[PDB]
């Protein structure tokens, strides 16, 4: 179902990576964040929701969505309630970039553009059809 996303944080090099997966396509968005925090999560959701038709969000750690900041973002945006593969791609391009956040975005790109239709194409095809 096309409005369903998964959201979790991983850790790498002492930093936090917020990973969102569009469950039906495998498409990912990610951001390096300073702190694993309610407010960072809330902001990330605001951004994600302005870009895609987000209806529901799941996570493997329910306490992620406990802050009032997160619930207020879900309320306003109308939202209700891969990490090893991405680390794999991060490891392969890690040498090419100084900043982890750069390596993360290179890895997101590679992941979404890989054909093995790509994830980036499936998300768009699934969403257009549903309209």
Ligand X SMILES: Cc1sc(-c2ccncc2)c(C2=CCC(C)(C)CC2)c1[C@H](OC(C)(C)C)C(=O)O
Task: With CB under 6 A as the rule, give the number of residues binding ligand X.
Answer: 14
First to last CA, the chain: 13
Contacts of 45 (CB under 8 A, 6+ apart): 7, 54, 57, 70, 73, 74, 77, 79
Helices (H), the chain: 38-51, 68-77, 83-93, 100-113, 119-130
Q: Angle, to 10 degrees, between the axis of helix 100-113 and the axis of helix 83-93?
A: 110
Of 14-22, 35-43, 57-65, 122-130, the window that binds ligand X (rule: CB under 6 A) is: 35-43
Of 6-14, 18-26, 45-53, 82-90, the window that binds a copy of itself (rule: CB under 8 A) is: 45-53
Of 5-13, 59-67, 83-91, 108-116, the window that binds a copy of itself (rule: CB under 8 A) is: 108-116
CA 21, CA 8: separation in Å to the nearest integer?
A: 9
Closer CB to ligand X, 25 or 42, in the complex: 42
Question: Does 98 participate in binding ligand X (rule CB under 6 A)?
Answer: yes
Q: Taking CB within 5 to 8 Å according to partner kind, which of a copy of itself, Mg ion, ligand X, none is near residue 29?
A: a copy of itself
Closer CB to a copy of itself, 94 or 101, in the complex: 101
Q: Are 22 and 52 in contact (CB under 8 A)?
A: yes
Closer CB to a copy of itself, 61 or 114, in the complex: 114
Q: Which residues bind ligand X (CB under 6 A)?
A: 39, 42-43, 46, 68-69, 72-73, 76, 96-99, 102
């Amino acid at each position: 179902s096309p409005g369903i996303w998964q959201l979790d944080c991983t850790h790498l090099e002492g930093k936090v990576i917020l990973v969102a997966v569009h469950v039906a396509s495998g498409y990912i968005e990610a951001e390096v964040i300073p702190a694993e925090t309610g407010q960072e999560t809330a902001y990330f959701l605001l951004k994600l929701a302005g870009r895609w038709p987000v209806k529901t969000v799941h996570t493997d750690n329910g306490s992620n969505f406990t802050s009032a900041a997160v619930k207020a973002a879900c309320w306003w945006a109308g939202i209700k309630q891969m990490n090893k593969e991405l680390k794999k791609i991060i490891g392969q391009v890690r040498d090419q970039a100084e900043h982890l956040k750069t390596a993360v975005q290179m890895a997101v790109f590679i992941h979404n553009k890989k054909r093995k239709y790509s994830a980036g194409e499936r998300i768009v095809d699934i969403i257009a059809t549903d309209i």
